[PDB]
Design an enzyme around this catalytic site. Structure first.
Site, PDB file in Angstrom:
ATOM      1  CB  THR A   1      -0.939   0.048   1.224  1.00 45.14           C
ATOM      2  OG1 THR A   1      -1.725  -1.150   1.276  1.00 45.14           O
ATOM      3  CG2 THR A   1      -1.870   1.266   1.158  1.00 45.14           C
ATOM      4  CD  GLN A   2       4.478   2.577  -3.501  1.00 48.25           C
ATOM      5  OE1 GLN A   2       4.572   3.689  -4.036  1.00 48.25           O
ATOM      6  NE2 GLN A   2       5.227   1.542  -3.867  1.00 48.25           N
TER       7      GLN A   2
ATOM      8  CG  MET B   1      -2.230  -6.581  -1.750  1.00 53.08           C
ATOM      9  SD  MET B   1      -3.491  -5.755  -2.737  1.00 53.08           S
ATOM     10  CE  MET B   1      -4.124  -4.565  -1.556  1.00 53.08           C
TER      11      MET B   1
ATOM     12  CD  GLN C   1      -5.926  -0.353   1.148  1.00 53.06           C
ATOM     13  OE1 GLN C   1      -6.943  -1.041   1.233  1.00 53.06           O
ATOM     14  NE2 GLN C   1      -4.836  -0.763   0.504  1.00 53.06           N
TER      15      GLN C   1
END
Ligand SMILES: *[C@@](C)(CO)[C@](*)(O)[C@H](CC(C)C)NC(=O)[C@H](Cc1ccccc1)NC(=O)[C@H](CC(C)C)NC(=O)[C@H](CCc1ccccc1)NC(=O)CN1CCOCC1
Ligand SMILES: [Mg+2]
Lengths: 244, 212, 233, 195, 222, 235, 240, 231
Positions: free
Chosen positions: C1-2, C107, E1
């Site tokens: 997640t970025q 992810m 997100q």
């Protein structure tokens, strides 16, 4: 590679014997004799210290007799260092059982697990076996007073009276001669000492060259007491039986 | 879904509908909801299609391996427990299953086991599983007796699915019947609700709520 | 997640009769702050491929290093590294496309939209898109970000389908690209006037143009606009 | 799963456990036996999360049976209850804990005394004259506080138990389809068929 | 997100005949309200007379097709060049899909070809691997528009024999390749009219014993 | 000592060559392939008369369409059979079809050389794998601990193998019926066996497309033994 | 981890470590298994060089694996415990998953499989143990008697013996045991078992152990006096 | 003598005896030939049987549509190495959409075999391989030895009596190299080459095994009645 230097500690001989177990037993046969005698009202543990020096501290010493818990003790024959590794494992095992079931560990269960550890070193891992033979003396509410022995093979057996270490052949004959089933603790104390006195390689048996312990129900009402004899208490019991 | 299976004098009846849904979208009207695991074992499917189709197939592979290793057909109890122990390992991961392992063996006799995705395993004589289970129960319970004939038992199983197919929006398509005897399972045809409803209405005189 | 920090805006491109054109401005935005002005977002690979990247600049620089390293690795034990066994645009794309999809599957994506423009060994024009999700598609005209909304409509008036490609010259094609860049300067709030343009032709090869500016702009009509309805002064 | 009760009397331990297995708006079964025999003189009833209950009960059952074979000896109810508690105490800090509450009724043959242990899913063990899990306690405990005596017979204990079930059937919201009653004493474990 | 899934739109359609099978799909690729490509094929010849399409999230769709194509290759290596039957392919695809049960391929898979008796076959899959053989299946964005039309025209649902008082159903029969292509073309022109994510072009792959043929038709580009 | 995966100067793996000697000590197993089916037969060889011979399991089912006979250190075969059964069922799960006999054999033979310093030594058992599939029909394979497998029209393994193989060379032809093949296995087994052949110390089996893999009863084999003796006395 | 291949082939095709494990079995005390019409009996020798023993607590030669299956052995005593433990665990695991106790064949097959695994695993030696496994399958009245050995091979026996001087007692059983008519009763089966051990033992005092297993988990061990009565009876019939 | 116990040991003269013993296993293997022109590359292999009742051991294996090899020596080792090549060819296709170069194929095999010659416990591969292929730089033929050494050649042969076929090809070099756009004539030259390695036995229909790859020809293997043309 490293194959060149492997002794192969866990293999069979052509005759179907485990080389390392046999040679470990040969090592134990030179160790100080230890005797266990089981009476109707208690158990005796006697052991001879290995050629003592006069400048050895005798009162604050422990070589042969070790306490596993309040109800079980062991007499050692072989490498002391090896025995202590196994003793600490046995002490931990007893406490695990108590923690799990809120009951003191039955003697045989403790003996089996310790003997199963020894067995492992003869079948896998490529390490040398423990050069130790134990005499287990203990009590539980199932079988009462019990004597066991285990050796580097990991094989264990139950006894009424038994010796390990040096001169077991001569010692076992003498025990087989004078032992009887209706025997008391005080009689068994006398037998244990008399046997060592005759099988010893020393000139004369003295207090400073011995370790002694009893497991009686001689406490107050339906409870077991472990007595590890002090030097002066061995001196007195040796005079009382007329050896010195 | 609506699925049922009940035990009786002449063995086990197993009946299912054939609808599949994705929300209010009717995805299929021709889904097989009975797994033919072996000639003596059946498995019913209510919940996630993929989960059922994948794992009950896998169950059949495990049952085949049992009879190769043990030189003997697997018990209904052992078969159901393989599946229940499998889904229990995945408990919480989100599998959706309510199945019935139905079969006959010598030692057990006719046996039905309810197994679901949260690990429940129950032996029983009657079970109904699915979104329309209550509709099926209503008809099944009120007409069930142990002494039903093979002919009457087949019809009650068929009629119970029809009842649910009618009322439950997420049940329908067609009825698939099975009869399990000491000799094994016997297939008793596919029955389209399109024709079956009117045929039952006319002949039985039921379904008076509907405009005839 | 970025979350993307320093970002690059639109990359636009199209095909013409003999090759492909690609362009992207020289800005590295930090949110609303137009932080960095000397950022090259077109990266050549050999003399036959140009990779145009938008999105996160830290991830863009990572991709640069991967491509740089790919050229080195291809040269190892390869006597025909500058001939038959040279890196094709299709090889370079498929590698990036593989990486982008693997990273999204873990992810932990490379927060980018990428367009690989080039010419194959057999002369065929290559132009294909890939983004953070691993999504890939090809079209006569390709654009990222605001370019997708504003440039594509303009470039599709020139090359609307496959059959329009042979009919489109390099002069007409470049003109349409430069015009699209001007329109983006008018309407994209994270664009700059300065940009780079690259042409890959099957005959004249790779032409890389730096320090271009948007010019011939219409602003004069602004003086006549007063207020927002009723004001006269 | 819902209702499990336990009463220790003079010479025995009596466990009562509801027969209903409910799922959503359907009673799937009305003859479910929520108990496992751990050893000849030890019985464990259980209640809680679906699947977990039986899985846990059978896991314990296997371990106690393994011990019995190995030592050719029956573990005391106290010993079994301590083993069970430790397993639940491990469980509560696991990735996915067993959500199972149990009652362990046993007859100690060495002491010649019946023993009832109540253990919740956290591993909270208590020895009690009478015990219950879930909402059952909120009715039965106060009733047993009044009517229970320590010197009661098994027959007196069964009547005391009937009184509890009657109260639950009167005031409990859900239909739990009666109870299966089992007695643990010097002669082992047996089931009361007519209750 | 970060959201690992996306929707690339488009719609696909599989119909099975007596000695043939077709697998059609529009060539439009989209994200939100933008067109990415007017011609991006998503129906593929995978060898052994098996055609495949995985519609939905294109990245997952491509990955799956790529993996199945590879699965066919290794089937030949490991089993003496044996031809992979359509039923075997279907089961293999289930395991590919279910292998990612807890992080699914967001796609609606359809394969088509001939079964081992030479008869036309169409299998359809959900995202996590459930599958079923059918005469008829539409998948993707416009599936809800096309499917009921197919029930009516392919399987003759709700159609009774005139004058029989709604007692005798219209009898089932196989359709010719000409009649099937007519239904496919009409299905997609209707879908294009009423669904925004459908248009640009139509690519049909026909599968007979002789091999895999292609046909292309223009669709409305608005 | 010396390494387990060592080559001899002649270019062979010592441990593989030594495992072949162990197989020569093993009991005889014969397989014959025909267009009507494949027959598998073995010498049971009970070490003592008190041993219940029906418990000797040297012929084994892998799947409905694949059977297997063994010779040598038969305890080593258990994990090979276990792998074969799993491989067969697993392929059916992945592909909704029966697995080719050759592909099954190849899967078993992949285990063979997975030894060294993986298991500690090669297998001390050879396998005759017989089966049927739609592509190549009735097949018979000989799987060794070297990792090699040959297809055979007929093949004998074990102590009486070289003598039995020479007999199979003369007797086999491409038009053999199943009944002819059954008698031929019995005939050749009786020739190489130490003790006298009967229904208790020898076992027959076959695999056909129609009925699949079947181990014969002692009653069925006994009649084939009686039929065999009568035919040899008839000329 | 210790990896050495201890069990390996020799030029003549033998695995010496397995064969030397058999020699350990040959050294072990004699054990015999005889199955009758409705029972199985396991007899075991105990050497009499050990006096001052405590027979209450000394590990018994016959071990219960489950309530319906027993295991005796010959060879290294320490090794046998490891097999017995694994067998007991597998017995409970089978009841847990299959909801049915193990068959005697299944339990034997498992124990034999363990023994085999130790003949081709790195860093381990084979078990110096052969076992006799006896009992009755669930809901079955047919007696079962199996034997295992270090190599891993196993098989069923009408009657069998293992250990030291086992070839002498096997010779006895081979002529004294009729296949057509096995020991019809418990007494007949025990007597034949005691007779066979008396060919080898020495004295019939505290040297012979007998364990009788009957259908439906009915296992009991005989006491000294009970066994001594068989010894007294056999000797009086012998003087003829 | 004392220095052949394992692969990790050098001899006093700097030799690796275990690698040499692995090389010996190739010499015992059945003959196989490889040759190429500018347009095509051909493998010819003499297959071997156990006896008349057995099948003939398959020598040729396919690695990709454009690449494959023939084997001589331990067949299971050829299966391991061919499987590795299949994966490497496949990795190149999936990741780079690129057909693997025949030269890189050799480099990868070399490096895989080498690791087995420098570490304790393992053993060298006991097989030699002839790899043919057609890639972006035309036709290729490679010879793999389990020492690690890989060599690109116009033609070669390995196995028992391979010197006869190797001498023939050395003479015929100028002729067969220019057989362009003619598959059957290039095979004929390969069949005549392998014939120089025959003793007492001749090429029969279930004995001979041929494989070819080229410009407009995928890697395909010919056995049975399909090779009757070339006898
Ligand atoms: C009755 C008929 C319904 O209650 C039965 O219970 C049947 C049982 C039969 C099929 C064995 N159940 C269903 O039909 C079942 C209902 C359901 C759905 C999802 C979860 C639990 C229960 N339906 C399905 O499984 C459908 C099958 C058809 C072919 C579409 N599949 C889906 O819903 C799939 C996969 C669901 C899923 C599960 C776990 C992880 C991810 C996904 N989902 C979609 O197809 C999504 N949908 C399709 C339309 O496009 C928008 C997205
Ligand atoms: Mg539009």
């Amino acid at each position: 590679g490293s194959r060149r230097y492997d002794s192969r500690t866990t293999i069979f001989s052509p005759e179907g014997r485990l080389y390392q177990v046999e040679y470990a037993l040969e090592s134990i046969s030179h160790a100080g004799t230890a005797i266990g005698i089981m009476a109707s009202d208690g158990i005796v543990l006697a052991a001879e210290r290995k050629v003592t020096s006069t400048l050895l501290e005798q009162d604050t010493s422990t070589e042969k007799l070790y306490k596993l818990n309040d109800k079980i003790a062991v007499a050692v024959a072989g490498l002391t260092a090896d025995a202590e590794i196994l003793i600490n494992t046995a002490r931990i095992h007893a406490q695990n059982y108590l923690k799990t079931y809120n009951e003191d560990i039955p003697v045989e269960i403790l003996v089996r697990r310790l003997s199963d550890i020894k067995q492992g070193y003869t079948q896998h891992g490529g390490l040398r076996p423990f050069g130790v033979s134990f005499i287990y003396a203990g009590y539980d509410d199932r079988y009462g007073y019990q004597l066991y022995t285990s050796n580097p093979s990991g094989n264990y057996t139950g006894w009424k009276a038994i010796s390990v270490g040096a001169n077991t052949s001569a010692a076992q004959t003498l025990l087989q001669m004078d032992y009887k089933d209706d025997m008391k603790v005080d009689d068994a104390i006398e037998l244990a000492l008399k046997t060592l006195s005759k099988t010893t390689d020393s000139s004369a048996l003295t207090y400073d060259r011995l370790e002694f312990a009893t497991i009686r129900k001689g406490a107050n009402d339906g409870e077991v007491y472990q007595k590890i004899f002090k030097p002066q208490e061995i001196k007195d019991i040796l005079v009382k039986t007329g050896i010195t | 879904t609506t699925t049922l299976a009940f035990r009786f004098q002449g063995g086990i009846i197993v009946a299912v509908d054939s609808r599949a849904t994705a929300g209010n979208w009717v995805a299929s009207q021709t889904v097989k909801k009975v797994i033919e695991i072996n000639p003596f074992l059946l498995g019913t499917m209510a919940g996630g299609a993929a989960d059922f189709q994948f794992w009950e197939t896998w169950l059949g592979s495990q049952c085949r391996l049992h009879e190769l290793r043990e030189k003997e057909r697997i018990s209904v109890a052992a078969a159901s427990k393989i599946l229940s122990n499998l889904v229990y390992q995945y408990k919480g991961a989100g599998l959706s299953m309510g199945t019935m392992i139905c079969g006959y063996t010598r030692k057990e006799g006719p046996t039905i086991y309810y197994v679901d995705s949260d690990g429940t395993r129950l032996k029983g004589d009657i079970f109904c599983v699915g979104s329309g289970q209550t509709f099926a129960y209503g008809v099944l319970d009120s007409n069930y007796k142990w002494d039903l004939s093979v002919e009457d038992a087949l019809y009650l199983g068929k009629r119970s699915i029809l009842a649910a197919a009618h009322r439950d929006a997420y049940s329908g398509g067609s009825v698939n019947l099975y009869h399990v005897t000491e000799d094994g399972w016997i297939y008793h045809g596919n029955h389209d609700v399109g024709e079956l409803f009117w045929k039952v209405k006319e002949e039985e005189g039921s379904f008076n709520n509907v405009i005839g | 997640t970025q979350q993307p920090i320093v970002t690059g805006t639109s990359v636009i491109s199209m095909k013409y009769d003999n090759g492909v054109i690609i362009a992207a401005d020289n800005l590295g935005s930090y949110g609303s702050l137009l932080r960095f002005n000397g950022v090259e977002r077109l990266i050549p690979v050999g003399d036959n491929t140009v990779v145009g990247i938008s999105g996160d600049i830290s991830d863009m620089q990572h991709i640069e290093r991967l491509l740089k390293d790919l050229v080195t690795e291809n040269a190892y034990d390869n006597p025909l590294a500058d001939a038959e066994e040279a890196l094709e645009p299709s090889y370079i794309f498929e590698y990036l496309a593989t990486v982008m999809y693997q990273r999204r599957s873990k992810m932990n994506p490379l927060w980018n939209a990428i367009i690989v423009a080039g010419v194959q060994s057999n002369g065929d024009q290559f132009l294909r898109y890939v983004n953070l999700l691993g999504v890939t598609y090809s079209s006569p005209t390709l654009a990222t970000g605001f370019g997708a909304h504003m440039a594509n409509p303009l470039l599709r008036k020139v090359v609307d389908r496959e059959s329009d490609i042979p009919k489109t010259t390099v002069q007409v094609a470049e003109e349409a690209i430069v015009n699209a860049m001007r329109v983006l300067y008018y309407r994209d709030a994270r664009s700059s006037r300065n940009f780079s343009l690259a042409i890959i032709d099957k005959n004249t090869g790779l032409t890389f143009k730096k320090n271009l500016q948007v010019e011939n702009m219409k602003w004069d009509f602004a003086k006549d606009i007063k207020g927002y309805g009723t004001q006269k002064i | 799963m819902d209702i499990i009760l336990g009463i220790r009397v003079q010479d025995s331990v009596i466990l009562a456990s509801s027969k209903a297995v409910t799922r959503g708006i359907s009673v799937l079964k009305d003859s479910d036996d929520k108990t496992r025999q751990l050893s000849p003189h030890t019985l464990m009833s259980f209640a809680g999360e679906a699947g977990d209950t039986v899985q846990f009960a059978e896991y314990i059952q296997a371990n106690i049976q393994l011990y019995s074979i190995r030592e050719d000896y029956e573990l005391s109810p106290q010993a079994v209850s301590s083993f069970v508690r430790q397993e639940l105490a491990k469980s509560i800090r696991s990735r996915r804990p067993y959500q199972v509450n149990v009652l362990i009724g046993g007859y100690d043959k060495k002491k010649n005394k019946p023993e009832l242990y109540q253990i919740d899913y956290l591993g909270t063990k208590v020895e009690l004259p009478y015990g219950a899990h879930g909402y059952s306690g909120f009715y039965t405990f106060s009733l047993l506080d009044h009517h229970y005596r320590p010197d009661m017979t098994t027959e007196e204990g069964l009547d005391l138990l009937k009184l509890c079930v009657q109260e639950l059937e009167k005031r409990m919201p859900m239909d739990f389809k009666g109870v299966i009653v089992k007695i643990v004493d010097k002669d082992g474990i047996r089931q009361v068929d007519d209750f | 997100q970060f959201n690992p899934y996306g929707d690339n739109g488009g719609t696909i359609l599989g119909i099975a005949g007596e000695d043939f099978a077709v697998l059609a799909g529009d060539t439009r690729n989209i994200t939100d309200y933008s067109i990415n490509s007017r011609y991006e094929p998503k129906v593929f010849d995978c060898g052994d007379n098996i055609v495949m399409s995985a519609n939905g999230f294109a990245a997952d769709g491509d990955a799956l097709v790529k993996r199945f194509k590879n699965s066919v290759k290794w089937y030949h290596f490991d089993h003496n060049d044996k031809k992979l039957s359509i039923n075997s392919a279907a089961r293999n695809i289930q395991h590919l899909l279910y292998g990612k049960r807890f992080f699914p391929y967001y796609v609606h898979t359809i394969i088509a070809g001939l079964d081992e008796d030479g008869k036309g076959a169409v299998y359809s899959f959900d995202p996590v691997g459930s599958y079923e053989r059918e005469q008829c299946r539409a998948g993707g964005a416009a599936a809800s528009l096309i499917m009921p039309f197919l029930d009516n025209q392919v399987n003759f649902k709700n159609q009774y024999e005139p004058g029989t008082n709604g007692k005798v159903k219209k009898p089932l029969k196989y359709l010719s390749v000409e009649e099937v292509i007519k239904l496919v073309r009409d299905s997609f022109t209707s879908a294009t009219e009423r669904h925004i994510q459908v248009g640009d072009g139509l690519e049909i792959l026909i599968v007979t014993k002789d091999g895999v043929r292609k046909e292309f038709y223009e669709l409305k580009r608005d | 000592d010396r390494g387990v995966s060592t080559f001899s100067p002649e270019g062979r793996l010592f441990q593989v060559e030594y495992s072949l000697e162990a197989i020569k000590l093993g009991s005889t197993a014969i397989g014959i392939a025909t267009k009507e089916g494949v027959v598998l037969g073995v010498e049971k060889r009970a070490t003592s008369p008190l041993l219940e011979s029906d418990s000797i399991e040297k012929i084994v089912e892998i799947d409905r369409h694949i059977g297997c006979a063994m010779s040598g250190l038969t305890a080593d075969a258990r994990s090979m059979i276990e792998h074969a059964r799993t491989a067969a069922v697993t392929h059916n799960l992945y592909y909704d079809e029966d697995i080719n006999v050759e592909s099954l054999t190849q899967s078993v033979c992949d285990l063979a050389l997975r030894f060294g310093e993986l298991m500690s030594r090669p297998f001390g058992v050879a396998l005759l794998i017989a089966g049927h599939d739609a592509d190549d029909g009735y097949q018979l394979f000989h799987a060794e601990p070297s990792g090699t497998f040959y297809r055979y029209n007929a093949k004998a393994i074990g102590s009486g193998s070289e003598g039995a193989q020479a007999e199979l060379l003369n007797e086999w032809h491409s038009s053999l019926t199943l009944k002819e093949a059954e008698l031929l296995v019995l005939k050749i087994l009786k020739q190489v066996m130490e003790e006298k052949l009967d229904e208790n110390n020898a076992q027959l089996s076959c695999i056909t497309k129609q009925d699949g893999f079947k181990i014969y009863d002692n009653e069925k084999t006994a009649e084939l033994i009686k039929e065999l003796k009568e035919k040899e006395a008839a000329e | 981890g210790y990896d050495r291949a201890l069990s390996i082939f020799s030029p003549d095709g033998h695995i010496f470590q397995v064969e030397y494990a058999l020699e350990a079995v040959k050294r072990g005390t004699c054990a015999v298994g005889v199955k009758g019409k409705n029972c199985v009996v396991l007899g075991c020798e105990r050497r009499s060089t050990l006096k001052l023993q405590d027979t209450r607590i000394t590990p018994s030669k016959v071990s219960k694996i489950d309530s319906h299956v027993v295991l005796s052995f010959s060879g290294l005593n320490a090794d046998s415990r490891i097999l017995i433990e694994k067998a007991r665990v597998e017995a409970q695991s089978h009841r847990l998953t299959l909801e049915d106790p193990v068959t005697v064949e299944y339990l034997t097959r498992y124990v034999a499989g363990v023994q085999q695994r130790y003949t081709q695993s790195g860093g381990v030696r084979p078990f110096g143990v052969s076992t006799l496994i006896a009992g009755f399958d669930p809901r079955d009245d047919e007696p079962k008697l199996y034997q295992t050995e270090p190599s891993g091979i196993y098989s069923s026996w009408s009657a069998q013996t293992i250990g030291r001087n086992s070839k002498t007692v096997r010779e006895f059983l081979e002529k004294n045991y009729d296949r057509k008519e096995p020991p019809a009763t418990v007494e007949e089966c025990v007597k034949l078992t005691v007779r066979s051990l008396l060919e080898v033992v020495q004295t019939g005092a505290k040297n012979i152990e007998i364990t009788v297993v009957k259908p439906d988990s009915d296992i009991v061990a005989l006491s000294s006096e009970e066994i001594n009565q068989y010894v007294t009876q056999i000797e009086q019939e012998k003087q003829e | 003598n004392n220095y052949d116990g394992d692969t990790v040991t050098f001899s006093p003269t700097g030799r690796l005896f275990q690698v040499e013993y692995a090389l010996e296993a190739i010499k015992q293997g059945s003959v196989t030939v490889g040759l190429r022109s500018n347009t095509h590359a051909v493998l010819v292999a003499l297959k071997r049987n156990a006896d008349e009742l057995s099948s003939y051991q398959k020598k040729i294996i396919k690695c990709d549509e454009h690449m494959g090899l023939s084997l001589a020596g331990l067949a299971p080792d050829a299966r391991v190495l061919s499987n590795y090549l299949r994966q490497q060819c496949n990795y190149s296709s999936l990741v780079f959409n690129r057909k693997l170069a025949v030269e890189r194929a050799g480099h990868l095999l070399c490096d895989k075999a080498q690791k087995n010659t420098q570490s304790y416990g393992g053993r060298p591969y006991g097989v030699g391989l002839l790899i043919i292929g057609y890639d972006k730089s035309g036709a290729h033929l490679l010879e793999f030895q389990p020492s690690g050494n890989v060599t690109e050649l116009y033609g070669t042969a390995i196995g028992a009596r391979s010197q006869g076929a190797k001498t023939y090809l050395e003479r015929t070099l100028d002729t067969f190299i220019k057989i362009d756009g003619n598959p059957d004539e290039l095979i004929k030259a390969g069949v005549e080459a392998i014939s120089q390695s025959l003793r007492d036995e001749s090429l029969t229909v279930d004995n001979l095994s041929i494989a070819i790859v080229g410009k407009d020809t995928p890697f395909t293997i010919y056995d049975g009645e399909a090779v009757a043309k070339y006898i």
